[model samples]
Target: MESDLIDLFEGAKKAADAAALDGVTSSGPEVSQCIDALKQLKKFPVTYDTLVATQVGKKLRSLAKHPVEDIKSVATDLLEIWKKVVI
Candidate 1:
């Protein structure tokens, strides 16, 4: 059902959070791979109400500060694009 589509974002959340916590060094999980999941979630048209409830924006925004420049730039771009679509 179309209702299930939003869960895709949730599925991607674990990968991303895990990456963020240990992403500071090579010793931890990485956001590098989760970017694909990000892009997938990016392609979905999110409802602003639901989006706020999910708090995905907050998570991704924090990712903008990551030491991995690659992840930082990509997440920033996604949030950039995601933000404009709402207003």
Candidate 2:
């Protein structure tokens, strides 16, 4: 299921990026979907450690800077969860 979650995260990020690049006014639930999946997967130490130790964290952190407030909020929540997991 780790691979499934990773794929979901990647797919959601891609969809969100496409929406933004297509000039869509709203990015839909793509980002939130990614955030939710990441949160779910992080319950496993393997998933959490791999993400925090790799570029995944960087990607998630970038989402915190997203223009959409809802997306940013979810991203922030994920990052906070990461902090708690690692520290």
Candidate 3:
């Protein structure tokens, strides 16, 4: 269970970092894949520590402005989930 948590967090952080660095406005290959990962990650139950380690809020915030509406929706939803977890 702990290892699975660690793996999930690491994957999320890497994807989030890529999204943060690449900005959501431009749909590059890495960003595209990163966005897909974010969509998947959001469906899983997340812990505060996982969110902190992944800094997913920053990534989601970036993605919130993405040109694709579906991506924006996913980011918005995930951000809400994170907010509920944090506060």
Candidate 4:
């Protein structure tokens, strides 16, 4: 499940890029995927150190600058959650 989450996050990044260029209306779900799966990360035993090693944190930060407002906010929330995860 951990590896799967990692892969999902990777796909979410791609989806985010396309979603940023495309209309938010069509991509809102995809844009929202950042936090959607982000929350799922807590379902398993995970930590900032392990996730950061996979560049998960970096990718999410990039998503924070997405063109869509919802997408940006979602990424922001994800970042905040990850901050708590750092503890």
Candidate 5:
């Protein structure tokens, strides 16, 4: 059955969003672990229109070698966005 990969990633992104909303803090390897699971959705076979995979994807891909920095940057950006939006 033909379907859109971006639609699939939308679900993955939703799950990631839920995890974040549930207060999954960006300490240790928690962020990287969830992101690696999310990346599998982006890496699957597909041949059609593509969705932008987000700079977070690049940060996620290199996370293992640079977990601390990756987590810090990701967390800071997210926090900044939330502060602006939620205030």
Candidate 6:
């Protein structure tokens, strides 16, 4: 669990850092959105096991078909890749 928390926080911070370093700029709302998201995430009681990469992969594949609703269907598809875990 400790390792997962470390990796999750480090990964998120790295992504934020990379965005800052890449000179990404816009008067756009993305930065504020990211900040709000991180702030809300910080409020949660997160731990290693909680940062499941398998679930993260599920989320990524869902977003790959993004701007669409009914993500839980995509989630099932992702979990299906593991076979043993499919519902």
Task: Using TM-score as the measure, name the better of candidate 1 and candidate 6.
Answer: 1
Instruction: Please give the range of 10 consecutive residues that has the lowest summed lDDT in model 4.
Output: 37-46
Which digits, one per residue and each the tens of the lDDT, describe model 4 over residues 30-80? 656655665665454557667766777776778788777776777787778
Best by lDDT: 4
State each model's CA lDDT, in order: 0.63, 0.62, 0.61, 0.69, 0.42, 0.39
Total backbone collisions, model 6: 1
* Tens digits of lDDT, candidate 6, 48-73: 34446434433334323432222223
Rank the candidate models, highest lDDT first. Answer: 4, 1, 2, 3, 5, 6
Per-residue lDDT of candidate 1, residues 5-41 (tens digit) = 3455455455566766654443344454556666776
Residues 1-87 of candidate 2: C-alpha lDDT, one tens digit per residue: 446646755765775575466554444565556556556645545445566555566677766776666656776887777678766
What is the clash count for each candidate, in the order shown? Answer: 0, 0, 0, 0, 0, 1
What is the Å distance of residue 71 in model 6 from its true position?
24
* TM-scores of the models, in the order given: 0.66, 0.65, 0.50, 0.72, 0.34, 0.33
* lDDT for model 2: 0.62
Q: Give residue 86's lDDT in candidate 6 (0 to 100).
A: 27
lDDT, model 2, position 73: 72
What does candidate 5's lDDT look like per residue over 1-87, in tens digits? 124444543454444455455666555344555455445543444322221243342333333233344444544444344335424
Q: Which portions of model 5 miss their true places by more than 4 Å?
A: 1-4, 26-37, 45-48, 52-87
Q: Which ten residues in a row have the lowest lDDT in candidate 5?
A: 46-55
| Candidate 6 ranges beyond 4 A from true positions | 26-87
